[PDB]
Amino acid sequence: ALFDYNATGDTEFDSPAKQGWMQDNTNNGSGVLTNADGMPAWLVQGIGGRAQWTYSLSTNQHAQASSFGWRMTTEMKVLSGGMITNYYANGTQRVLPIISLDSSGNLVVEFEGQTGRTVLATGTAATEYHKFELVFLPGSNPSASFYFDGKLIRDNIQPTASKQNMIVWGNGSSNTDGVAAYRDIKFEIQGDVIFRGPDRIPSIVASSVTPGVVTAFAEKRVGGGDPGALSNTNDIITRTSRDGGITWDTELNLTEQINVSDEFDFSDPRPIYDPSSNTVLVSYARWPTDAAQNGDRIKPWMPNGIFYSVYDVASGNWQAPIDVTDQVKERSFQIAGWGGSELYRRNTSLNSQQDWQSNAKIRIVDGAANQIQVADGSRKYVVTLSIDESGGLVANLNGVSAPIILQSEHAKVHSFHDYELQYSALNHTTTLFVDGQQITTWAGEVSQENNIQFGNADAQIDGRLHVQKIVLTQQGHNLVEFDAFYLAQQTPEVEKDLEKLGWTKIKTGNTMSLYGNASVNPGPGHGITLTRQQNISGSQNGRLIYPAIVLDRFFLNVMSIYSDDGGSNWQTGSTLPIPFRWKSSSILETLEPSEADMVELQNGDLLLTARLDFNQIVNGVNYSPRQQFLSKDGGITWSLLEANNANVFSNISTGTVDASITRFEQSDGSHFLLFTNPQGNPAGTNGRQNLGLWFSFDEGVTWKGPIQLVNGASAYSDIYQLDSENAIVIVETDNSNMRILRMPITLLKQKLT
Ligand SMILES: CC(=O)N[C@H]1[C@H]([C@H](O)[C@H](O)CO)O[C@@](O)(C(=O)O)C[C@@H]1O
Ligand SMILES: CC(=O)N[C@H]1[C@H]([C@H](O)[C@H](O)CO)OC(C(=O)O)=C[C@@H]1O
Ligand SMILES: [Ca+2]
Numbered sequence: 196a197l198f199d200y201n202a203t204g205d206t207e208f209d210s211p212a213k214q215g216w217m218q219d220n221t222n223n224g225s226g227v228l229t230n231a232d233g234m235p236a237w238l239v240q241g242i243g244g245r246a247q248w249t250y251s252l253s254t255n256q257h258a259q260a261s262s263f264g265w266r267m268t269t270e271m272k273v274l275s276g277g278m279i280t281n282y283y284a285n286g287t288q289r290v291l292p293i294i295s296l297d298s299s300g301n302l303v304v305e306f307e308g309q310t311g312r313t314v315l316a317t318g319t320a321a322t323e324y325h326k327f328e329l330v331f332l333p334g335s336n337p338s339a340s341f342y343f344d345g346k347l348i349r350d351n352i353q354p355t356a357s358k359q360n361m362i363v364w365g366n367g368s369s370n371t372d373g374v375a376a377y378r379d380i381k382f383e384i385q386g387d388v389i390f391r392g393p394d395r396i397p398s399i400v401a402s403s404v405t406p407g408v409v410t411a412f413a414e415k416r417v418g419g420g421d422p423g424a425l426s427n428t429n430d431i432i433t434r435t436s437r438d439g440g441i442t443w444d445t446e447l448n449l450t451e452q453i454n455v456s457d458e459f460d461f462s463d464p465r466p467i468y469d470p471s472s473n474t475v476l477v478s479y480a481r482w483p484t485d486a487a488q489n490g491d492r493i494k495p496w497m498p499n500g501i502f503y504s505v506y507d508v509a510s511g512n513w514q515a516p517i518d519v520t521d522q523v524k525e526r527s528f529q530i531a532g533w534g535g536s537e538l539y540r541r542n543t544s545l546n547s548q549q550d551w552q553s554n555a556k557i558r559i560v561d562g563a564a565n566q567i568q569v570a571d572g573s574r575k576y577v578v579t580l581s582i583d584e585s586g587g588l589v590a591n592l593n594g595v596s597a598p599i600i601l602q603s604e605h606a607k608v609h610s611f612h613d614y615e616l617q618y619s620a621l622n623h624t625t626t627l628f629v630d631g632q633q634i635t636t637w638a639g640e641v642s643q644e645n646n647i648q649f650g651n652a653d654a655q656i657d658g659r660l661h662v663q664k665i666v667l668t669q670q671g672h673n674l675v676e677f678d679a680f681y682l683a684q685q686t687p688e689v690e691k692d693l694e695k696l697g698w699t700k701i702k703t704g705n706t707m708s709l710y711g712n713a714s715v716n717p718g719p720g721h722g723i724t725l726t727r728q729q730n731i732s733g734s735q736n737g738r739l740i741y742p743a744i745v746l747d748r749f750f751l752n753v754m755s756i757y758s759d760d761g762g763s764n765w766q767t768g769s770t771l772p773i774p775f776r777w778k779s780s781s782i783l784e785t786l787e788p789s790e791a792d793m794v795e796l797q798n799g800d801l802l803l804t805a806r807l808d809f810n811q812i813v814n815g816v817n818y819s820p821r822q823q824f825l826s827k828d829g830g831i832t833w834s835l836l837e838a839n840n841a842n843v844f845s846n847i848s849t850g851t852v853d854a855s856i857t858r859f860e861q862s863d864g865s866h867f868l869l870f871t872n873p874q875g876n877p878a879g880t881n882g883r884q885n886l887g888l889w890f891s892f893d894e895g896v897t898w899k900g901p902i903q904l905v906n907g908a909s910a911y912s913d914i915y916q917l918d919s920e921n922a923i924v925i926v927e928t929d930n931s932n933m934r935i936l937r938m939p940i941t942l943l944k945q946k947l948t
């Protein structure tokens with residue numbers, strides 16, 4: 196909440212008394228509006244008496260101030276005297292800066308509870324306007340810092356005992372004469388509640404084109420709890436502020452219009468602010484109301500998907516939800532030949548004396564030894580697909596030494612392609628077409644086998660391929676038809692088992708196969724619009740992107756979901772590379788990255804920080820509850836950053852929880868990163884308490900901090916830059932109540948070093 200005074204000549208507000216303040220003078224104390232400085236200002240005349248203005252607060256307001264902090268900003272010039280006291284007393288204590296001009300005319304400041312003085316200015320500067328800031332940070336040992344024209348003057352100012360209870364400004368002394376002119380006074384109590392529990396999962400973004408416009412989001416949880424529960428009906432809600440996050444409009448339910456029968460739960464509002472159009476595009480997941488991500492309950496035949504809503508900042512209008520599920524929710528049969536081999540063979544009776552054709556729509560997730568083959572009783576034709584050292588898609592044909600480079604652009608390397616083999620009896624050769632394009636012709640190898648086969652063929656060569664369709668034809672008749680795209684979307688009432696459909700499963704070692712992705716979820720936090728991609732091959736400026744959570748069947752991982760056309764068409768990137776190990780040739784040990792957040796670095800690389808759920812130890816290596824990743828291709832592929840995990844964040848909580856990361860750019864052009872997460876209480880233990888703020892001045896190599904922003908409950912949070920000097924934070928606190936913090940970043944950074 197803000198309590199302020201802005202000097203103006205406008206009649207309706209031409210005095211502090213007309214702006215909510217109470218006059219509190221004694222004897223000859225007085226005041227008058229002055230214009231001698233070009234801009235109006237209120238002249239406090241404390242000659243022969245006290246001259247001050249006060250504001251009273253309630254018990255609840257003082258408590259909020261103590262737990263979430265406060266800040267006082269003053270723009271004034273001292274004309275003469277002393278005891279110019281602008282402060283806040285809460286009934287038990289106060290931080291009191293005493294400003295005055297000494298006998299030589301220098302502007303100086305002293306602090307109750309502190310001995311000495313600090314000269315702030317001399318000469319003509321001593322009697323000119325200046326900006327004074329007092330910032331109080333909560334904690335077991337809370338203190339305040341004083342800034343003069345943006346520069347840290349005094350830190351760790353201890354509160355002193357006092358019975359006064361009020362916000363005050365002016366000359367607070369009946370005996371000491373003091374005269375000062377005020378242009379503006381602002382006392383802000385941090386922590387206003389914007390969304391109330393049991394609602395949860397906050398995210399927030401602000402407009403750069405229209406400074407002051409902020410859009411916040413959360414999950415409206417009627418009945419409470421995570422999505423997927425029969426006892427709740429969850430929707431996406433939002434509120435907008437046009438004054439920097441001080442006042443907010445009516446809570447708005449964005450998804451009830453597409454949840455008319457309460458048949459769904461919506462979750463994870465992931466907003467992205469696009470400067471090119473000055474709009475906010477928020478993506479969110481849909482789930483049937485009785486099955487979701489937790490417990491892997493959601494299945495491919497269920498209504499999970501992703502939708503988005505668009506907000507026009509200029510006119511302040513929201514647009515109806517748009518479904519993009521088909522673009523980002525993969526439907527296929529997946530074979531993970533990681534630590535083994537898994538092939539499916541269907542014996543056939545092809546006639547090598549006549550033409551035959553086969554089609555296989557395949558996507559290579561990773562590795563090699565991924566193949567599709569067809570044998571017709573005379574010759575065998577095998578196409579082996581792999582990812583080379585450069586990350587390109589390569590094909591090798593049996594009997595041909597020279598490998599064929601199919602794709603070099605990472606996005607196309609891991610996308611689905613239609614591999615079509617056309618055998619010509621009269622030419623005794625087979626032609627390979629990829630996506631309708633003729634690639635090469637070869638003779639294969641002599642063979643007596645007659646079949647069609649696909650999968651990962653080598654236990655010593657890791658590889659994962661996803662298939663959407665397989666067909667073999669001859670004489671205009673389909674000999675084999677396997678539509679995985681269709682089957683993955685069917686209920687258990689339909690037969691989907693390859694072995695029951697006529698195929699033979701040939702497996703060795705350890706492998707896993709399954710149908711389509713169980714679900715896609717934008718995840719908690721905000722997304723970003725890239726603007727430093729000029730030197731990133733395959734990427735582009737303007738790209739909208741966020742790190743989504745994808746569940747294949749049992750395991751969670753993260754992948755980029757992005758759009759290169761403003762949000763109309765979306766594409767998915769590759770999942771994060773994580774270690775895996777089979778214990779005793781039977782127990783799978785791997786990681787499960789989930790709730791993630793990303794930021795674009797100065798050189799265009801993308802830094803991603805992700806929560807690691809469930810198992811966190813692989814082959815004796817503990818990856819902690821959080822791990823950072825890096826992308827050098829616009830978010831298509833990632834790399835796990837060695838030793839860059841929860842440990843780079845000193846005093847971060849040891850419990851798994853969502854965090855937030857974002858870029859902060861100052862007016863001088865300099866920049867750095869901001870990160871928020873609970874510190875735990877004590878700091879460094881498991882607990883969603885005391886939200887902390889970390890800073891990175893080296894592109895995420897190291898982090899400084901944390902600066903404690905909250906004293907008490909602190910769970911999920913999201914931070915975003917508000918303007919050149921402030922960042923806005925939304926955080927879940929007591930009973931998950933989401934509160935707003937508006938932090939003076941350019942000031943706080945001075946408390947580090
Ligand atoms: C900032 C502050 O607390 N000032 C207070 C002063 C000072 O304690 C004395 O002038 C000693 O300098 O005492 C008062 O009775 C006064 O003079 O009006 C009340 C006023 O609020
Ligand atoms: C979409 C969803 O259910 N995510 C939930 C998440 C999830 O269960 C965990 O990340 C394991 O995957 O847990 C929590 C949580 O406060 O810890 C809140 C989220 O609502
Ligand atoms: Ca409803």
Ligand SMILES: [Ca+2]
Binds near residue numbers: 423426427459460483
């Ligand atoms: Ca539900």
Ligand SMILES: [Ca+2]
Binds near residue numbers: 721
């Ligand atoms: Ca987050």
Ligand SMILES: [Ca+2]
Binds near residue numbers: 748749751
């Ligand atoms: Ca699971």
